[PDB]
Design an enzyme around this catalytic site. Structure first.
Site, PDB file in Angstrom:
ATOM      1  N   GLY A 165      14.429  33.683  20.824  1.00  0.00           N
ATOM      2  CA  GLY A 165      15.247  34.603  20.335  1.00  0.00           C
ATOM      3  C   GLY A 165      14.986  35.902  20.949  1.00  0.00           C
ATOM      4  O   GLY A 165      14.145  36.085  21.791  1.00  0.00           O
ATOM      5  N   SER A 166      15.868  36.874  20.566  1.00  0.00           N
ATOM      6  CA  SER A 166      15.779  38.329  20.940  1.00  0.00           C
ATOM      7  C   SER A 166      14.438  38.809  20.632  1.00  0.00           C
ATOM      8  O   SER A 166      14.283  40.162  21.077  1.00  0.00           O
ATOM      9  CB  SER A 166      17.095  39.009  20.337  1.00  0.00           C
ATOM     10  N   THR A 167      13.566  38.253  19.815  1.00  0.00           N
ATOM     11  CA  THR A 167      12.412  38.702  19.679  1.00  0.00           C
ATOM     12  C   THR A 167      11.573  38.814  21.101  1.00  0.00           C
ATOM     13  O   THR A 167      10.826  39.681  21.213  1.00  0.00           O
ATOM     14  CB  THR A 167      11.521  38.031  18.689  1.00  0.00           C
TER      15      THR A 167
END
Length: 640
Positions: free
Chosen positions: A383-385
């Protein structure tokens, strides 16, 4: 010479039929039942091999040093060293002697009892005594029990000793009132299809004092496997089940009377935990007087396994997931000690090992959220992590200037019209976005643009310095992380999508905590560690130390800034460097896409702990950040 070669063939075919377990086929290779030939008939050779080798669980008969010569006009003698596997271990260095017969056109084995075992004579019997080995325990980093063995009392009535007419309804009302059980529940179990008059129907599991037994009830002590954390660590620890006849055929050294690990660490460490069976395999006289011992070992109980797990952190991390689908990984990022490996939803490992109903088992298996999955070892898109890694790579290769401000107009962006119906989406509407803003507001458009500006070659160069493709030295079944399906993206969309943790990235939470540990070790990757006594392993110079000292201050602002995506964690009042993230998922069984919520967080002051939590297919108003307050308090107070 022409017959000496055929004699060596009949010896090997005889050995192979014994090795393959087909004793009838080996018995049909023996001569006639006579003096100086075969001692027994064919069916009696079958029954002698099937009884003796079956009693010792003989498996895998291998021979060596075969020598066959000639003794008379029709008698040929053979000899060979042999070894085999039994329920008491390997029986090596066996000197087998025998003679052959070449009467008609075939060559047969003058069968003697000395071919079952070297020094057998006539009506010599074979005795085998065995003693079960107690299964070792599994404990956390502080010695708390995670998987132990103990005795439990099994209450149960006997149908034949319960009554006849009237005395049955009275003794059932007493075997239910004295043990606090609904009276209508005893009749539905003593009347199942498997019940017989003289059987034993197991009722309740007593966990205390045994009351006065009415007419019909009797206790039965059984050795049980207990799991104190229960479902909170069911995926990691696993469970054990009754050993079947198929298991013994694959490994005779198991105890056909014991338990075997079926999943998790109970199966991974099955050999170290189950120990070795003690006993004695001997040859006796016709009456039973012991002659020669073949094997003899003492019982060796299994070794305990000490993990890096924190029993209190494991339970807290699991309970914080509230039964929803997701996972949480806690580590000490400087050493790699896996403090907690939680997966949700879960199953009852005690109910799984102490008799599980087919109704309840099908519920676990048909549950769409799939509680049997070890989600900490399942490949997900980060994810955008993952913006931290892409930014750190961009800072290293000189692509990203932390103070340069990109202009982003709107919430949707694409490189040009060739992208079709794919657009990088920004959560917040921020026109002026620099590196610090992109990490605070979790802006995917900034990262997608900087990823395309960086180029695939520079991007993969920084990605290759991590653990993609590596097999972690962990006793957990696991597939290595991958950047994409092939060695080339061959797509600007896939390149930009990979920039903010989407695309074809597959990284399990354990591998995520390994890659993210670079921010707690000045750019050095520290491999995770589950076994406490293992030595800390690392991988230096993964990202530049300059990128760590540039990003971690921004990750503090992800918590401290009033618009930071993890601002609700500033309520803790503890030093936090965090980074939220969402992964856009599109499965076939749904029309609208799903979403996976992520939270990465660690102590930027002391680097004592690090957390990576994910909610899979998040419900509305729900996130991983909302559920991490309790675990962050515990990790901060106990791991500095």
């Amino acid at each position: 010479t022409q017959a000496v070669e055929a004699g060596e063939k009949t010896v090997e075919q005889f050995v192979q039929a014994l090795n393959k377990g087909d004793y009838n086929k080996a018995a049909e290779m023996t001569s006639k039942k006579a003096a100086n030939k075969s001692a027994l008939s064919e069916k009696e050779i079958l029954d002698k091999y099937q009884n003796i080798y079956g009693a010792a669980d003989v498996k895998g008969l291998q021979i060596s040093n075969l020598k066959v010569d000639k003794k008379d006009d029709s008698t040929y003698s053979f000899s060979y060293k042999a070894k085999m596997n039994t329920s008491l271990g390997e029986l090596k260095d066996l000197s087998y002697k025998g003679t052959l017969d070449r009467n008609d056109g075939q060559t047969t084995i003058n069968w003697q009892p000395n071919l079952v075992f070297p020094e057998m004579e006539g009506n010599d019997k074979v005795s085998l005594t065995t003693q079960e080995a107690a299964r070792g325990n599994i404990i956390d980093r502080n010695g708390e029990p995670l998987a132990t063995t103990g005795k439990l009392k099994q209450l149960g009535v006997v149908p034949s000793k319960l009554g006849d007419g009237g005395e049955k309804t009275a003794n059932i009302k007493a075997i239910a009132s004295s043990f606090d059980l609904t009276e209508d529940a005893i009749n539905q179990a003593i009347s199942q299809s498997w019940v017989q008059p003289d059987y034993f129907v197991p009722l309740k599991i007593i966990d205390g004092a045994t009351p006065e037994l009415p007419a019909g009830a009797t206790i039965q002590e059984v050795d049980g496997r207990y799991y104190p954390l229960g479902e909170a660590a069911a995926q990691l620890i696993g469970y054990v089940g009754d050993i079947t006849a198929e298991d013994i055929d694959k490994n005779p050294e198991l105890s056909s009377n014991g338990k075997i690990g079926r999943s998790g660490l109970e199966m991974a460490f099955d050999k170290d935990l189950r120990g070795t069976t003690g006993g004695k395999l001997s040859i006796t006289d016709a009456d039973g007087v012991e002659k020669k011992v073949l094997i003899e070992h003492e019982v060796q109980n299994g070794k305990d396994i000490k993990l890096t797990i924190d029993a209190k952190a494991q339970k807290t991390a699991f309970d914080s997931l509230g039964g929803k689908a997701g996972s949480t990984v806690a580590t000490t990022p400087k050493t790699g000690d896996l403090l907690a490996l939680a997966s949700s939803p879960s199953y009852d490992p005690n109910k799984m090992t102490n008799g599980i109903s087919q109704e309840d088992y099908k519920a676990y298996e048909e549950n769409p959220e799939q509680p049997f999955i070890s989600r900490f070892a399942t490949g997900y898109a980060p994810g955008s992590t993952f913006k931290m890694i892409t930014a750190a790579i961009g800072l290293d290769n000189g692509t990203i200037d932390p103070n340069e401000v990109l202009t982003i107009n709107g919430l949707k962006w694409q490189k040009d019209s060739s992208w079709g119906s794919y657009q990088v989406t920004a959560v917040s509407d921020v026109s002026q976005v620099d590196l610090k803003t992109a990490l605070i507001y979790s802006d995917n458009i900034y990262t997608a643009q900087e990823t395309l500006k960086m180029g695939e070659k520079k991007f993969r160069t920084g990605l290759d310095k991590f653990i993609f493709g590596e097999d972690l030295d962990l006793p957990i079944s696991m597939n290595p992380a991958q950047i994409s399906n092939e060695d080339s993206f061959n797509s600007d969309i896939l390149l930009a999508d990979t920039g903010y943790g989407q695309g074809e990235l597959l990284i399990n939470p354990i591998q995520q905590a390994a890659m993210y540990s670079v921010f707690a070790n000045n750019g050095t990757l520290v491999y995770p560690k589950l076994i406490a006594d293992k030595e800390t392993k690392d991988k230096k110079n993964v990202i530049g130390e300059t990128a760590v000292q540039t990003i971690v201050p921004d990750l503090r602002e992800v918590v401290q800034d009033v618009n930071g995506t993890a601002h609700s964690l500033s309520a803790l009042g503890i030093p936090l460097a965090a980074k939220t993230g969402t992964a856009e998922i599109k499965e076939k069984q749904d029309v609208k896409g799903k979403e996976n919520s992520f939270l990465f967080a660690f102590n930027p002051d002391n680097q004592g702990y690090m957390m990576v939590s994910m909610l899979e297919n998040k419900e509305d108003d729900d996130s991983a950040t909302k559920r991490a307050s309790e675990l962050l308090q515990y990790l901060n107070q106990n791991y500095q």
